[PDB]
Amino acid sequence: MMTTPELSCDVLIIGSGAAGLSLALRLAEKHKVIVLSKGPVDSIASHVEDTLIAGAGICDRHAVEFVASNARTCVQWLIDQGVKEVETTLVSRAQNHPNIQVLERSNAVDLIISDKMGLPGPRRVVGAWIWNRNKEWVETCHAKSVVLATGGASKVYQYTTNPDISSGDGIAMAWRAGCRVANLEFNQFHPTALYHPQARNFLLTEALRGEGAYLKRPDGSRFMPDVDERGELAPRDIVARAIDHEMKQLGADCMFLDISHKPDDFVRQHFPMIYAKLLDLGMDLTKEPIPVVPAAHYTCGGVVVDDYGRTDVDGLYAIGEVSYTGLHGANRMASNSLLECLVYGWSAAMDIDRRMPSVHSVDALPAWDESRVENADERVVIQHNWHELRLLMWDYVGIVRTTKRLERALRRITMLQQEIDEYYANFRVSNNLLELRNLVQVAELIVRCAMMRKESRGLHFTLDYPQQLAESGPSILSPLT
Ligand SMILES: N[C@@H](CC(=O)O)C(=O)O
């Protein structure tokens, strides 16, 4: 049962995006930090008002003012660290810091909570079990504090702009550890991702439509003027809903983006990189329409945190897209996702620093169960379930929602949960199984938040409740009820 941990640190940071790496640089000035990477590593007043408007009336004003007031000093700190040229600096710094150990190709399995090993005092995180992909075994990491910085949950959807950072593992682990989550119905979709077998999540920018690109049905006709007087210039969420409608109504695999009516020099001049990438895949931006589908892009909800980035579990923090701070409300304003992870990283660091002397090391932790069950055919079904989840979320908790579609999603999600419990119990850990467990867990939370909201607001659009409620707030789920 109890054994000496393979790994020990003062702060375990799960996730290696901008949020995780910038917090790592802050804390590693004083503390031993491990970073787990899944793969290779205007006035304040107007910002506040713009954020509140973007959030469609359910922003937490306290959080909005917190981020807007501290934005400039936290961005200056980032610049002084030596500044996606931000990622180049952060990755280089994190890999060359004496007090940071970057562990690549390692997946957190679950958080180790003190009350499950008879430690006295209020329950707190004391470490995590970690799947080492190169060694194919589960290790134990002792940590005095743990920070979730794993990104969002967009991978629950079959189309996603950034799959490698959107598996929802931080949200699922926090839920299993007893944390509230919130606002998981507010998922931002990019309207025009390239639909091609070798697209590698390539995005067609809205600048194409800004310069006059048309959005076409498979038969060549333009659908945007039929639904919005601004046509292809409508706001992002309106374009995404229209594409979703056309695809589902027509049973079409994709819509099409076409600038071919513009002269060829106009196209090559304004979008040289887009023109270059598409001809490499066999598509001519100056002659033919480009196949596009919407794609899940950003999770405005997540693990509930306070001003310090503290979750409901002592010692456990969450910053960046994995967290729900209240900053965003029902939608996202562009620049706020970076400001959020800098400001809450600063305040998390302050709290972690002040808390550290009171935390005493644990010299023995519960080892991972043997988990030796193996059936090769059942292992293949894990992949079927993974695809089934991502498709049902696209259909039933997608861009356009209805009450009856949400019911179908919850029914299937519940079935998958019960099957996972029944069929994969004590299965040997694998990346696919961990991802399936987490995707299904977070899908349940997403659909339960979407079902709670009896109105259309921001990123939550339901045909059954087209209007906004006069008074509203966030959708909060508790695992303790
Ligand atoms: N904090 C990053 C994403 C992340 O790593 O959570 C951003 O949204 O800018």
From Swiss-Prot:
The active site is at R236. One of its GO terms (biological process) is 'de novo' NAD biosynthetic process from L-aspartate. One of its GO terms (cellular component) is cytoplasm. Keywords: Cytoplasm, FAD, Flavoprotein, Nucleotide-binding, Oxidoreductase, Pyridine nucleotide biosynthesis. Pathway: Cofactor biosynthesis; NAD(+) biosynthesis; iminoaspartate from L-aspartate (oxidase route): step 1/1. It is an enzyme of class 1 (oxidoreductase). One of its GO terms (molecular function) is nucleotide binding. Pfam families: FAD_binding_2, Succ_DH_flav_C. Coiled coil: none annotated. Its main location: cytoplasm. It is found in: Cytoplasm. It catalyses: L-aspartate + O2 = iminosuccinate + H2O2. Its cofactor is FAD. Its EC number is 1.4.3.16. It comes from the Bacteria. Binds 1 FAD per subunit. Gene3D superfamilies: FAD/NAD(P)-binding domain, Fumarate reductase/succinate dehydrogenase flavoprotein-like, C-terminal domain, Succinate dehydrogenase/fumarate reductase flavoprotein, catalytic domain. FAD binds at S16, G17, A18, A19, K38, D169, E321, S337, L338. Belongs to the FAD-dependent oxidoreductase 2 family. NadB subfamily. Catalyzes the oxidation of L-aspartate to iminoaspartate, the first step in the de novo biosynthesis of NAD(+). PANTHER family: L-ASPARTATE OXIDASE (PTHR42716), L-ASPARTATE OXIDASE, CHLOROPLASTIC (PTHR42716:SF2). This is L-aspartate oxidase. The gene is nadB.
